[PDB]
């Protein structure tokens, strides 16, 4: 006949992967040089990354340069849209699938006039600027993350250049900027709050996301809270029986009091809930202890226990 009341909260494992938002920049160049003069067209395209100075323009003012420069064995090739010159073009919203990614693209070339035929067929050059917004997901060990369109990056999302997180990509590709201003399309003309963004060059495109600490992901999730449980001691175990959910949780150890090791996330959550519940009940009860006690069930469940004692009015 050893019974004690209290308040109980049950936490379970987290299986939903960590998720965050990314944005991608790329430059697309297409060649229609194979006009088959000899009457069909055989065009091949290519994609390229974006440098730092250009990304600052796109993120804030939504403008890009329609000119790409490459290099190969000391040979450099420069192309312009419609064979023009170095100029600034705007980016406009582009329609797409409902509830998906959002794309901003610049207009293509004005025209593609025919040229010569036979060996030297008509050659056309076009360049486009693209911006895409999607989401990415990563799992518990944080070895890689995958974007929406299906592109994988072999790097932990929490890496910052001086941490111990996994980073198997090229060394001279990752750099992090501080006090970075990025604004949305609808509010061109307002300065937002500076943040810390991380950039990565994948050769074919560029990726950027807001850097954050590892304390933003937590491996435990709240399941239920019970208000009128009763703790009964059986000598070598403790039974927490509640008649609201009709459940009984049995722990292997009697003393328990195993303080959380790495599950320090819930300290703020349990502190608010227990304090809130006790206030509505403190009319006829007093706290029998000052510190919350933690146990672990035979199954994978974590319990927070705070005994309560009645007040002798």
């Amino acid at each position, epitope marked *: 006949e050893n019974h004690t009341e209290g308040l109980l909260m049950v936490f379970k494992d987290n299986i939903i992967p960590y998720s965050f938002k990314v944005r991608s920049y790329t430059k697309i160049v297409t060649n229609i040089l194979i006009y088959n003069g000899h009457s069909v067209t055989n065009r091949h395209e290519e994609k390229f990354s974006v440098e730092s100075y250009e990304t600052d323009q796109m993120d*804030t*003012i939504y*403008q890009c340069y329609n000119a790409v420069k490459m290099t190969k064995d000391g040979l450099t090739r420069v192309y312009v849209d419609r064979d023009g010159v170095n100029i*600034t073009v*705007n980016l406009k919203p582009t329609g797409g699938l409902a509830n998906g990614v959002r794309r901003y693209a610049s207009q293509t070339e004005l025209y593609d006039a025919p040229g010569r035929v036979e060996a030297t067929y008509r050659t056309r050059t076009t360049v486009n600027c693209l911006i895409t917004d999607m989401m990415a997901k990563s799992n518990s060990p944080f070895d890689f993350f995958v974007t929406t369109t299906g592109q994988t990056v072999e790097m932990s999302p929490f890496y910052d250049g001086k941490n111990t997180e996994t980073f198997h990509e090229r060394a001279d590709s990752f750099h992090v900027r501080t006090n970075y*201003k990025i*604004v949305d399309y609808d*509010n*061109r*003309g*307002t*300065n*937002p*709050q500076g943040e810390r963004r991380a950039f990565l060059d994948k050769g074919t495109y560029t990726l950027s996301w807001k850097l954050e600490n590892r304390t933003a992901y937590c491996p435990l999730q709240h399941w239920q809270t019970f208000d009128s449980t009763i703790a009964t001691e059986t000598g070598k175990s403790i039974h927490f029986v509640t008649d609201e959910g009709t459940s009984s949780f049995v722990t292997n150890t009697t003393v328990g009091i195993e303080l959380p090791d790495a599950f320090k996330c819930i300290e703020e959550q349990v502190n608010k809930t227990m304090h809130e519940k006790y206030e509505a009940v403190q009319d006829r009860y007093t706290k029998g202890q000052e510190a919350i006690t933690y146990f672990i069930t035979s199954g994978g469940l974590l319990l927070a226990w705070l005994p309560l004692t009645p007040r002798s009015l």
Partner: antibody
Amino acid sequence: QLQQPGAELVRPGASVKLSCKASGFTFTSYWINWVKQRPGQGLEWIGNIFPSDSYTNYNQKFKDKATLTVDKSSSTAYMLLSSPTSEDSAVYYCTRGGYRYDSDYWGQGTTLTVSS
Amino acid sequence: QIVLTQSPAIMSASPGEKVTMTCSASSSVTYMYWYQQKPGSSPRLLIYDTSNLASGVPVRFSGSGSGTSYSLTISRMEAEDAATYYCQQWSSYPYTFGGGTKLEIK
């Protein structure tokens, strides 16, 4: 440079236009903002036309009194006032915006004289 | 639509003492800018982002703040530092200015 001509007389009921010549910088990378400064009072914002575009964001109450426009070729901006009255005698400045710390060059200011 | 309130109106201060003017906003703002306008001239920028210094502004001028409370302070005031000072916001699209502060020497 950002120079503005002044010394103009306003006839009530007749629309007036103001010019703000911009030179020495790329005109398609910033914005022009027009501000009205009533003498003896604080400054007031009107709107901000975006060159290279047409994003003329206007004030919450100046829709019926303002009209912005630009000549990309002549690198110039203009302020059109519709049905001016005698209570709006003030000085108007054209300012350059931008998300870069480099500069935001304030204009000189055009005085407006409206009377009988 | 955020309205800026400048509680100080008349300084009438003499050289020798520090002077501080605070700008209060009805709502939260990301940053704040300070403009000094001498009579018969266009205003000039002094402080941007509530903590930085413009070009040509001497070390004396400085300010700080957070949320909806900001202020500017100076160290060695001379005769030429008697002008009007305005606080302007940027986050909300209507670029609302402030009441302004008059500084006098006596």
